[PDB]
Amino acid sequence: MRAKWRKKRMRRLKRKRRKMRQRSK
Amino acid sequence: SLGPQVAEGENVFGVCHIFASFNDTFVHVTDLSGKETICRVTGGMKVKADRDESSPYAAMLAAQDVAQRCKELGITALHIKLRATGGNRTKTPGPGAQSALRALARSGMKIGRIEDVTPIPSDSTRRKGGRRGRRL
Amino acid sequence: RVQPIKLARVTKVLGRTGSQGQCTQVRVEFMDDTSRSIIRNVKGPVREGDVLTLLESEREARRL
Amino acid sequence: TKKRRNNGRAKKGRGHVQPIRCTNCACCVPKDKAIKKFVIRNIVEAAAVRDISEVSVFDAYVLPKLYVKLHYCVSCAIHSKVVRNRSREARKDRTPPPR
Amino acid sequence: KKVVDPFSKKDWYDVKAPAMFNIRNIGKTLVTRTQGTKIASDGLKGRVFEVSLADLQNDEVAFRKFKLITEDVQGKNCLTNFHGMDLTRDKMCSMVKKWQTMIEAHVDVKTTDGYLLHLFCVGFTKKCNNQIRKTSYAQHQQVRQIRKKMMEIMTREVQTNDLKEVVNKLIPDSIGKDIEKACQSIYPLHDVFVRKVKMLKKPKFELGKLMELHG
Amino acid sequence: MGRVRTKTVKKAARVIIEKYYTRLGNDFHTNKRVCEEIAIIPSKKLRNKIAGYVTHLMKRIQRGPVRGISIKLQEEERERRDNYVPEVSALDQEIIEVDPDTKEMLKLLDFGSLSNLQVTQPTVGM
Amino acid sequence: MPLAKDLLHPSPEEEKRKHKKKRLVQSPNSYFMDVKCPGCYKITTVFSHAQTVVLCVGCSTVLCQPTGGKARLTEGCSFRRKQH
RNA sequence: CGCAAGACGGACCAGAGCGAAAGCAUUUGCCAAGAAUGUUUUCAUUAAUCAAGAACGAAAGUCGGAGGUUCGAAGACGAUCAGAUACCGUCGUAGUUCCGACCAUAAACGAUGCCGACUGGCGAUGCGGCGGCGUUAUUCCCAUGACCCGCCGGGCAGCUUCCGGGAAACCAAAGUCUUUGGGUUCCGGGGGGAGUAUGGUUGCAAAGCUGAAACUUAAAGGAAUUGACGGAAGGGCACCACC
Ligand SMILES: [Mg+2]
Ligand SMILES: [Mg+2]
Ligand SMILES: [Mg+2]
Ligand SMILES: [Mg+2]
Ligand SMILES: [Mg+2]
Ligand SMILES: [Mg+2]
Ligand SMILES: [Mg+2]
Ligand SMILES: [Mg+2]
Ligand SMILES: [Mg+2]
Ligand SMILES: [Mg+2]
Ligand SMILES: [Mg+2]
Ligand SMILES: [Mg+2]
Ligand SMILES: [Mg+2]
Ligand SMILES: [Mg+2]
Ligand SMILES: [Mg+2]
Ligand SMILES: [Mg+2]
Ligand SMILES: [Mg+2]
Ligand SMILES: [Mg+2]
Ligand SMILES: [Mg+2]
Ligand SMILES: [Mg+2]
Ligand SMILES: [Mg+2]
Ligand SMILES: [Mg+2]
Ligand SMILES: [Mg+2]
Ligand SMILES: [Mg+2]
Ligand SMILES: [Mg+2]
Ligand SMILES: [Mg+2]
Ligand SMILES: [Mg+2]
Ligand SMILES: [Mg+2]
Ligand SMILES: [Mg+2]
Ligand SMILES: [Mg+2]
Ligand SMILES: [Mg+2]
Ligand SMILES: [Mg+2]
Ligand SMILES: [Mg+2]
Ligand SMILES: [Mg+2]
Ligand SMILES: [Mg+2]
Ligand SMILES: [Mg+2]
Ligand SMILES: [Mg+2]
Ligand SMILES: [Mg+2]
Ligand SMILES: [Mg+2]
Ligand SMILES: [Mg+2]
Known part of the structure; x- marks a missing residue:
């Protein structure tokens, strides 16, 4: 299901980017 | 050959415990109490392919070998208790069930009372396979 | 494992069985006590009335 | 779009019904969606009755039956040809097929 | 056990039934005869x-299987006693x-003797002879009253009787035959069967009591 | 195989029968000549097929009437039965008789003679 | 639905088939009745849908039972519907 | 033949019941609650819908205890296959179970807000009430219980058709709409970027709520029709098909 898998991959990328932005700050 | 020292007027009864399943069949003759057993013959003793262990020919081959030993020792009649795999599983007698039972009649042995003895739950543990079932 | 031979007379032709329609369902009596009857799958061109020879008569045909 | 007025299920005025396992599939199908079938067959046979009614040590012995309640997948029942397709106008006939 | 054809080291016995049953010759069993430390009577x-029940009373239905427990052997003979009742699958x-x-x-009751019994009972409502509707459903209070009236009878008739006197009522099942009548002003209920009887607790042996059940 | 006749043969045979009903018999070798002389069939095979279906129809018209050919002899036996016959009489006995709630109805339109009664069990299927 | 029904002059019986309120003018289905205990002797006046337990005076010390609908008299003889 | 443990309440079980929804099925007792029906009881407009705010809220998941039978993410093997980190098989951790705190999301669906009025027919069905012959049980009895034949309230639904509507599929409501106005809350404005970035708030975490723009594009989409195709089903057929 491209919809929920798109959702999961975007959630993963957003979690990663937020954790990096918080760590380096 | 020693057996029950009367059989000319009355028969000597037994129980046959036919367990028929989609992987194999047993024929298993015990005394009238069930605790002391006599010859037990299984479909995989009578074929050399795993796929054939649950087949009517292996079933009647076993029923004949059982009836011969039964007649030879002391027994002339039988009661029948018929088993599917039962609770949590297939709950329906396998393919070998109808053939062993009639290969007892075609072999001299006399038949008594027939019952089904499949174990049935009042409600079960969880069945194998996950919620989407065995999909293949 | 030790059984004699049984001659059986055909009394009815039922249909053509097998993947290619290559064998025939046939009902037979047993030449000794006509009160017996079984169903077999025969390979050749069977009419009604022929006499088949059974090497194993305790079997019965299901299909195919 | 909407293929069945009842959504292909017997539920009306309920939130939930208890699931059950498809008898060969082990699937997980709602009790009022699954396809049920109650079979009542002779324990011995239809052909091999003579070989047993003759060997019985009882003169008048009635052979027992074997009652089984089967629950079926939708896919699993279509594949065993328990059910088939129907016309768009014939799907509305809900009578059991003539014996 | 792989002694020489170990069925040539077995001895056969007779299995006798209690005095109530018309037919008292159940059948035969086999046991390995006595050796240095393993006694045959124990095993x-x-x-x-x-x-x-048909194979014991000779006059009635084929269902209602009985269970008989072996109590004491007496010189090529087995003395059995009641151990439970049941019905057939079909x-x-x-x-x-x-x-x-x-x-x-279901109830639990005691027999004036020490036998504690665990009796079960079942019944079904009845379509009336002229009914036109398709279902014979009873309301909840009716079912509760019927269950109460069933338990009360199933205890009354076991608190007042010896183990032998109660088994004699289980043989033709008069208990169900009177529950069917008692519950007729609530809902027709065209069936009552004591579909099972379990043996929970039984007192000490007292062979004098067993031999009375066989005389 | 075949031996299924075509509409061109069946319609021809039906017309031949419906006009020359009294010249046709039960044998084939005479019906052949009759149809040869009364019609114009531009072939011999077609003539034989038409004359062979005519015989199979004639063998049936001797029994109950078929539903595609109308002749004179078989119409009289309808006509003379559609007019009244002594198998029928009047209303079979002119002392026909009723139940209550009909006498109660008849009373509301002034009737007063020659009837009976009965009362049933009080509802259906009892 | 005869398409020309008369609403102003309904049937004398089809206007007692309807609900107590859906009729042309409302009317209760209940009534008051004289009741006689066969023991003491008075003329107790009782509501048909009583919903209370009624006694006469002393004596029987019961005269009606309440139910989900019309009350039932024990053996109170001769009961008369009172009128308008 | 016995013993123990932890799960789970089959068949009866239905287009049936109950609850605001999520959900709810072994017996018995206790505790409080509830709709409908019956009423010639009582108060007398006390009502409908609702920013702020509030209670409950499947599964999965987080924290701390108890327990751990069965099943089983992750993981280890055996197969299948070019590969197979999958479908199949044998094990198996977290979890699945109970308690005390969180989280507030589901194709949470009748994809259909709530209150009220009007507009066809029919046969059933669960609850309450009313009327009426006859069967049936107890106590022979009156009561009553099981059936039978109707009527009335409101409930879950079904069949029917030129009420009417609609793009149609279909709908007695999705009707009473260019002959347009009974009351009221929420909410949409071509397809993507995107439920994204950013600010705020909540949470232990996972995450929930609120929520753009630059840029890009002539279509994306709905219902139905005719073909072609299907490792879809039914019936037939051909040595350019097989046996
Ligand atoms: Mg497993
Ligand atoms: Mg498949
Ligand atoms: Mg589709
Ligand atoms: Mg739901
Ligand atoms: Mg219910
Ligand atoms: Mg149960
Ligand atoms: Mg409100
Ligand atoms: Mg709000
Ligand atoms: Mg949860
Ligand atoms: Mg959880
Ligand atoms: Mg916490
Ligand atoms: Mg924990
Ligand atoms: Mg893995
Ligand atoms: Mg691997
Ligand atoms: Mg591949
Ligand atoms: Mg594959
Ligand atoms: Mg696996
Ligand atoms: Mg496992
Ligand atoms: Mg949550
Ligand atoms: Mg909250
Ligand atoms: Mg949502
Ligand atoms: Mg929604
Ligand atoms: Mg409305
Ligand atoms: Mg109704
Ligand atoms: Mg009623
Ligand atoms: Mg009444
Ligand atoms: Mg009642
Ligand atoms: Mg409701
Ligand atoms: Mg409706
Ligand atoms: Mg509406
Ligand atoms: Mg309006
Ligand atoms: Mg837009
Ligand atoms: Mg938003
Ligand atoms: Mg933020
Ligand atoms: Mg262009
Ligand atoms: Mg389309
Ligand atoms: Mg198309
Ligand atoms: Mg096909
Ligand atoms: Mg050919
Ligand atoms: Mg070839």
Whole structure:
């Protein structure tokens, strides 16, 4: 299901980017 | 050959415990109490392919070998208790069930009372396979 | 494992069985006590009335 | 779009019904969606009755039956040809097929 | 055990039934005869024989299997005693069917003697002879009243009787025959069967009591 | 195989029968000549097929009437039965008789003679 | 639905088939009745849908039972519907 | 033949019941609650819908205890296959179970807000009430219980058709709409970027709520029709098909 898998991959990328932005700050 | 020292007027009864399943069949003759057993013959003793262990020919081959030993020792009649795999599983007698039972009649042995003895739950543990079932 | 031979007379032709329609369902009596009857799958061109020879008569045909 | 007025299920005025396992599939199908079938067959046979009614040590012995309640997948029942397709106008006939 | 054809080291016995049953010759069993430390009477006691009622009373139905426990051997003879009652799969399955109400009950009771019994009971509502509707469903209070009236009878008739006197009522099942009548002003209820009897607690042996059951 | 006749043969045979009903018999070798002389069939095979279906129809018209050919002899036996016959009489006995709630109805339109009664069990299927 | 029904002059019986309120003018289905205990002797006046237990005076110390609908008299003889 | 443990309440079980929804099925007792029906009881407009705010809220998941039978993410093997980190098989951790705190999301669906009025027919069905012959049980009895034949309230639904509507599929409501106005809350404005970035708030965490723009594009989409195709089903057929 491209919809929920798109959702999961975007959630993963957003979690990663937020954790990096918080760590380096 | 020693057996029950009367059989000319009355028969000597037994129980046959036919367990028929989609992987194999047993024929298993015990005394009238069930605790002391006599010859037990299984479909995989009578074929050399795993796929054939649950087949009517292996079933009647076993029923004949059982009836011969039964007649030879002391027994002339039988009661029948018929088993599917039962609770949590297939709950329906396998393919070998109808053939062993009639290969007892075609072999001299006399038949008594027939019952089904499949174990049935009042409600079960969880069945194998996950919620989407065995999909293949 | 030790059984004699049984001659059986055909009394009815039922249909053509097998993947290619290559064998025939046939009902037979047993030449000794006509009160017996079984169903077999025969390979050749069977009419009604022929006499088949059974090497194993305790079997019965299901299909195919 | 909407293929069945009842959504292909017997539920009306309920939130939930208890699931059950498809008898060969082990699937997980709602009790009022699954396809049920109650079979009542002779324990011995239809052909091999003579070989047993003759060997019985009882003169008048009635052979027992074997009652089984089967629950079926939708896919699993279509594949065993328990059910088939129907016309768009014939799907509305809900009578059991003539014996 | 792989002694020479170990069925040539076995001895056969007779299995006798209690004095109530018309037919008292159940059948035969075999046991390895006595050796240095394993006694035959021990390895022979405590066996259970499930016998149909037709094969014991000769005058009635084929269901209602009885269980008989071996108590003490006496010189090529086994003395059995009641151990429980049950029904056959086919009857119990042919009774449960759609568009009805099935009513079940169960009690635990003691027999003036030390036998503690665990009796179960079942019944089904009845389509009336002129009914036009399709279902014979009973309301909840009716089912509760029927269960109460069933338990009360199933205790009354076991608190007041010896173990032998109660088994004699289980043989033709008069208990169900009177529950069917008692529950007729609530809902017709065209079936009552004591579908099972369990043996929970039994007192010490007292062979004098066993030999009375065989005389 | 075949031996299924075509509409061109069946319609021809039906017309031949419906006009020359009294010249046709039960044998084939005479019906052949009759149809040869009364019609114009531009072939011999077609002539034989038409004359062979005519015989199979004639063998049936001797029994109950078929539903595609109308002749004179078989119409009289309808006509003379559609007019009244002594198998029928009047209303079979002119002392026909009723139940209550009909006498109660008849009373509301002034009737007063020659009837009976009965009362049933009080509802259906009892 | 005869398409020309008369609403102003309904049937004398089809206007007692309807609900107590859906009729042309409302009317209760209940009534008051004289009741006689066969023991003491008075003329107790009782509501048909009583919903209370009624006694006469002393004596029987019961005269009606309440139910989900019309009350039932024990053996109170001769009961008369009172009128308008 | 016995013993123990932890799960789970089959068949009866239905287009049936109950609850605001999520959900709810062994017996018995206790505790409080509830709709409908019956009423010639009582108060007398006390009502409908609702920013702020509030209670409950499947599964999965987080924290701390108890327990751990069965099943089983992750993981280890055996197969299948070019590969197979999958479908199949044998094990198996977290979890699945109970308690005390969180989280507030589901194709949470009748994809259909709530209150009220009007507009066809029919046969059933669960609850309450009313009327009426006859069967049936107890106590022979009156009561009553099981059936039978109707009527009335409101409930879950079904069949029917030129009420009427609609793009149609279909709908007695999705009707009473260019002959347009009974009351009221929420909410949409071509397809993507995107439920994204950013600010705020909540949470232990996972995450929930609120929520753009630059840029890009002539279509994306709905219902139905005719073909072609299907490792879809039914019936037939051909040595350019097989046996
Ligand atoms: Mg497993
Ligand atoms: Mg498949
Ligand atoms: Mg589709
Ligand atoms: Mg739901
Ligand atoms: Mg219910
Ligand atoms: Mg249960
Ligand atoms: Mg409100
Ligand atoms: Mg709000
Ligand atoms: Mg949860
Ligand atoms: Mg959880
Ligand atoms: Mg916490
Ligand atoms: Mg924990
Ligand atoms: Mg893995
Ligand atoms: Mg691997
Ligand atoms: Mg591949
Ligand atoms: Mg594949
Ligand atoms: Mg696996
Ligand atoms: Mg496992
Ligand atoms: Mg949550
Ligand atoms: Mg909250
Ligand atoms: Mg949402
Ligand atoms: Mg929604
Ligand atoms: Mg409305
Ligand atoms: Mg109704
Ligand atoms: Mg009623
Ligand atoms: Mg009444
Ligand atoms: Mg009642
Ligand atoms: Mg409701
Ligand atoms: Mg409706
Ligand atoms: Mg509406
Ligand atoms: Mg309006
Ligand atoms: Mg837009
Ligand atoms: Mg938003
Ligand atoms: Mg933020
Ligand atoms: Mg262009
Ligand atoms: Mg389309
Ligand atoms: Mg198309
Ligand atoms: Mg096909
Ligand atoms: Mg050919
Ligand atoms: Mg070839």
